[PDB]
Amino acid sequence: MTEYKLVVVGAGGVGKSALTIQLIQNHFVDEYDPTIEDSYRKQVVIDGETCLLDILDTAGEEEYSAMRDQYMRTGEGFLCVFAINNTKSFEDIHHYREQIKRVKDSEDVPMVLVGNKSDLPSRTVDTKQAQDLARSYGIPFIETSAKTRQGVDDAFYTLVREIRKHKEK
Ligand SMILES: Nc1nc2c(ncn2[C@@H]2O[C@H](COP(=O)(O)OP(=O)(O)CP(=O)(O)O)[C@@H](O)[C@H]2O)c(=O)[nH]1
Numbered sequence: 340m341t342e343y344k345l346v347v348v349g350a351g352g353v354g355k356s357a358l359t360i361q362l363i364q365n366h367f368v369d370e371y372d373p374t375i376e377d378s379y380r381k382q383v384v385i386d387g388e389t390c391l392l393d394i395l396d397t398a399g400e401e402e403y404s405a406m407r408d409q410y411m412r413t414g415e416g417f418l419c420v421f422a423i424n425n426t427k428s429f430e431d432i433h434h435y436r437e438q439i440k441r442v443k444d445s446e447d448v449p450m451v452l453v454g455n456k457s458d459l460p461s462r463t464v465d466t467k468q469a470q471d472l473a474r475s476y477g478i479p480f481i482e483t484s485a486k487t488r489q490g491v492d493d494a495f496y497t498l499v500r501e502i503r504k505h506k507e508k
């Protein structure tokens with residue numbers, strides 16, 4: 340009944356779609372399918388409010404288009420996703436944050452840093468590295484596994500709460 344527009348961004352391969360599908364389907368999509376839907380709706384009660392989440396699951400490597408920016412500009416909050424076994428994707432968070440600041444023309448956009456694939460061994464990005472980056476940005480850091488669902492609902496609900504901290508809903 341209250342709509343929240345959420346946008347999921349991050350490098351190609353970090354699990355943006357798998358995260359969204361876990362929230363939507365309670366299932367782990369184990370293969371890469373480039374034709375998967377990118378626009379989802381999820382109705383859930385968060386702190387006693389009935390929330391209709393309108394989720395845009397973006398393409399990580401899509402190049403500039405006015406249309407791409409226009410779709411992102413509708414977002415009220417952003418999940419910025421890297422994978423904990425993908426150092427480049429972690430470093431690339433700088434690019435996605437700058438992109439969001441530009442598209443929204445704002446330094447205070449609701450945002451959660453998400454470190455996905457926590458089910459995997461020998462991670463290459465330590466939790467303390469991610470905590471430090473999120474601290475530098477003034478945003479929460481949440482670790483997730485789209486495979487097990489660990490942290491997935493936390494990431495989306497925390498983003499909803501970050502939006503409420505920024506604007507009346
Ligand atoms: N072990 C594990 N694998 C995952 C996890 N999340 C996604 N993957 C796997 O990573 C690969 C890429 O997942 P996908 O969700 O398509 O990534 P994406 O970020 O949406 C790719 P694009 O930006 O091109 O749309 C898939 O093989 C998928 O199953 C995870 O939490 N754990």
Ligand SMILES: [Mg+2]
Binds near residue numbers: 357397
């Ligand atoms: Mg995807």
